[PDB]
Subunit: 303 residues, 4 copies
């Protein structure tokens, strides 16, 4: 898949970030993974982000990532596969090239590690990672890596395979400046945790799709919220927000990291053997898991 | 008017916040203010907020506020006038009652002073202020006073004259939860500094309308954006954003307080003797004034 | 006093900020105020801050402040009396003068209202307030009013009655640069909530003394800790922190504003008729007063 | 050495973190590195941190870190050598064992990568890295990894080789609580960028010592500030703060990352070809380098 093709796919529907499955011993569980990814397939997300932040990228050994990408590819079907990438330039470049080789259709470039960095250095970092590969690249504003509109424009002019922008800052004023400035030069992806809480405002800002972490365990509900979004059916979105997403928010807000941990708890409750999180996330308590199962309720997958 | 009549007016169009005029001596300049306000009401803003944030409420003596509202109300015409309010509860009540008595159509309750507060404290504070008058109150989320949805719904049950919510947090997750929760129990006002930057997303979040600071000096342009916004002209909105508002933000971001100071400089440049800002704001340098002057350009009054 | 006289008094002992008593309705209750203050006077604090933050300045009418100040210095004795001041420039001077005409030995200029301001603006504001009175002024670094050292040096060189510096920021780097730059031109008062947690560090940073809020209800403990701190008794300071202060911090951290609320719950526990906090503060629940009571323990005032 | 010995060396003087030298192509430059480190040895810092934050740990490939630790070990003499370590648990463990293997005297565990994490997770992550090696371990509070006192207590009880605590928060309230609770169970290192700005308050808060980035290029000056601090020569410290540290601070605050870039520039100015920083740091401008060279003034090691 060339950069323009992954670009088109990014704009053709809802985006899903599968959790990464671990056995009791914390090693990658490829059979469980594929099973979950085969099931998600039936709901026809156009792009699958393998080993994103929902997939606990920040806890993966670098040589684990190609293995997880290839597992997804086996059962993904006609779904474009994008791989997480990140860390400093030297590691990111080696990851990017490792997943290109196993057939990734693009990379999602998560922040570099630890330091706050001037816009100059950001530009220099991302330019080299983009130049390391021929596949499509999506950048990702969050935490210690926040590209300004001017800087992003420079990267776009100089790196044709840079085709997408994921936002995790919540900075409405900045992301509207970015879509105004760049136009159709980039596909714009909402990437806040529980992005449905943000989807309608982001529409207005120029974002017509987002990553839906909850699609991991209630894809039917996520597909419905998305269809309601694109059709302008505001009473339907509002109902789904009050009935499911705000109550999910309250479970998520009980501890740091639960934007990943509550999602993986939901996978397990729906009968997929996703297993535990790697430290330093912690898994939900039994009580908390009980509150989640009750919320899933009518959307339970088995008994 | 009654709370429901201001509620309706509040959602009926673009809202404006006139700067407060001062003179050499430093006192409020009433006739100047009156000739500025009168010029604005001719651009058909349904509601005017006298002595709000942009009207430097934070730098106003309690006694001054009813004179400014009086001045505004004199030449407001068909436009309704909502008055700034604020500080701690005791002063807030005292201020509320003074402006009701000179016929304020409503109250915009700015946050209390200095301290952080629990939700149950904000409840008691806002409740006490609402109940001391009969006119409509709009609460204002920003800084040290941020109402959660459940606390807000609690106030709305308790005080029927609380009819509006103004955001200045830019917390787009929170404000969508507030509109989803309350529904039409409230009117929702975009109140970010230079809110045109947030207007398209605020509407997606379900906001009734927003307030335009820059309307103070380029009301024609503010009206143009607002109409293109309501009629879906995304490309026209984009042009005005790119050519005017983002260059304005580059001037505003040069220093703290310029959300007010640059607006005020805009007013003077168009021939209204608005005077300086009061400490601890500072006025634009002569360079910055010229930048803003250059940016106004074609719109020069 | 003259400015140099309150300057001198400010540096010669442990200072504190008496809570303002309200009746249950409730306005200022000067009877209960005076008896509470008189009991504190016997604990020999040399400077007394009437209507400061701990005394809910932020919730007082500008009329109530001279009344509170006069109520204070009636029973204060030879103890010096400093008044709160604050809000915008215009209100601030009015309050400044108000309390000077009822005998205040100086003023603590609390931050201006709401907005963020330029250094130059902070300069013009504080300069005008200093030149409105003849009594001594101490500035207060906190929230939206944070003076840098170059700015502070300019105010010192323009307003001779500006003689004290209270920090509420906890910014170590900044206050060490301030004491380095100004030398003995200013008296430096540590002003964090529960400043005892910070006292051992602020000495090293060059700070003359600090404010003890808990002096309100356990002034024996505050004098025991302050004495050890000055004598270089680390093991004794360390005991009282492990035993009292970090437990008191756990309660104080239960809710916003409890840096005053928990202190006023402590005063009422020792039989002083302080009454409620004014909104938007709230009072501790019964359970939390229970918690506090158990902690006060042996230091409980008795007949 | 064993954990108690490194604990002792950690408490015995001023500590420093050498920049990592790179050639123009960004590769590790070991010739220049050992040359610079041999110079830092003459000034007798009792502990040397190779590939710490000042040494651009966050930009090193994991396989580079053992090579760097080995180079510094060649010319360090009797100075203890501690290795940077970090990222999430799996990577951190591999690095930890790799540097134990080339003979490091301990590790400094930088924060895990990207995410805010609950105290229980930090416990689990740090406990697993400690248990992976036999050498001394120092924890490092900063940014997305901030241990509470109660959490650090349990790690201390569970992991004997955990012997040190470096602070990067500047949270004086919290670090006082931490020394009050742990006592001499741990040695305490001040670790703010330009820690001399903080040294006097931190000793007060009971910190065993601190680490001086600027020792990289004016170790004479850093040494004298340190002796003055320990002797209570307050006027001496204050003179050096006003004449050098606040001026350096003003250079350092002109851009993000210059807490490391400004130090590397200073090393270059002193005639050690430390080379450029790796992106996303950027190097000082020629102009800014000019300001740094004039500030260094009388403390120049060379004439150009
Ligand atoms: C981006 C999407 C954010 C959702 C989450 O972190 O759970 C990503 O996962 O990389
Ligand atoms: C609220 C924000 C209004 C900005 C505007 O004038 O549009 C306030 O200034 O009080
Ligand atoms: C810790 C010391 C901080 C100084 C700096 O980052 O320059 C470290 O370098 O690991
Ligand atoms: C000063 C701050 C004292 C706080 C404390 O010691 O807890 C003030 O209230 O103005």
């Amino acid at each position: 898949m060339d950069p323009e093709q992954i670009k088109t796919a990014l704009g053709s529907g809802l985006l899903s970030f599968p959790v990464t499955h671990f056995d009791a011993e914390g090693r990658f569980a490829a059979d469980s993974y594929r099973e979950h990814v085969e099931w998600l397939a039936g709901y026809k997300a156009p792009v699958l982000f393998a080993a994103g932040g929902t997939g606990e990228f920040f806890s993966l050994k670098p040589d684990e990532i190609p293995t997880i990408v290839a597992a997804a590819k086996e059962v993904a079907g006609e779904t474009a596969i994008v791989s997480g990438c990140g860390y400093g330039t030297e590691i990111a470049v080696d990851i990017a090239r490792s997943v290109e080789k196993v057939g990734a259709d693009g990379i999602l470039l998560l922040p570099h590690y630890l330091i706050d960095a001037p816009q100059e250095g950001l530009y220099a970092h991302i330019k080299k990672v983009c130049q390391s590969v021929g596949i499509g690249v999506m950048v990702y504003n969050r935490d210690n890596s926040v590209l300004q509109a001017d800087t992003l424009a420079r990267l776009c002019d100089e790196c044709p395979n840079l085709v997408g922008f994921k936002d995790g800052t919540g900075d409405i004023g900045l992301v509207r400046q970015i879509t105004a400035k760049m136009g159709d030069r980039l596909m714009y992806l909402g990437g806040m945790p529980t992005a449905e809480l943000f989807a309608e405002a982001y529409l207005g800002a120029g974002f017509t799709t987002y990553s839906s972490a909850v699609f991991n365990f209630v894809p039917g509900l996520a597909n419905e919220f998305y269809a309601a979004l694109r059709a302008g059916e505001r009473a339907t979105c509002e109902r789904i927000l009050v009935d499911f997403f705000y109550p999910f928010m309250a479970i998520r807000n009980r501890a740091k990291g639960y934007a990943v941990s509550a999602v993986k708890a939901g996978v397990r409750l729906q009968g997929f053997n996703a297993g535990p999180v790697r430290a330093p996330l912690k898994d939900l308590t039994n009580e908390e898991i009980g509150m989640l199962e009750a919320l899933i309720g009518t959307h339970k997958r088995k008994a």
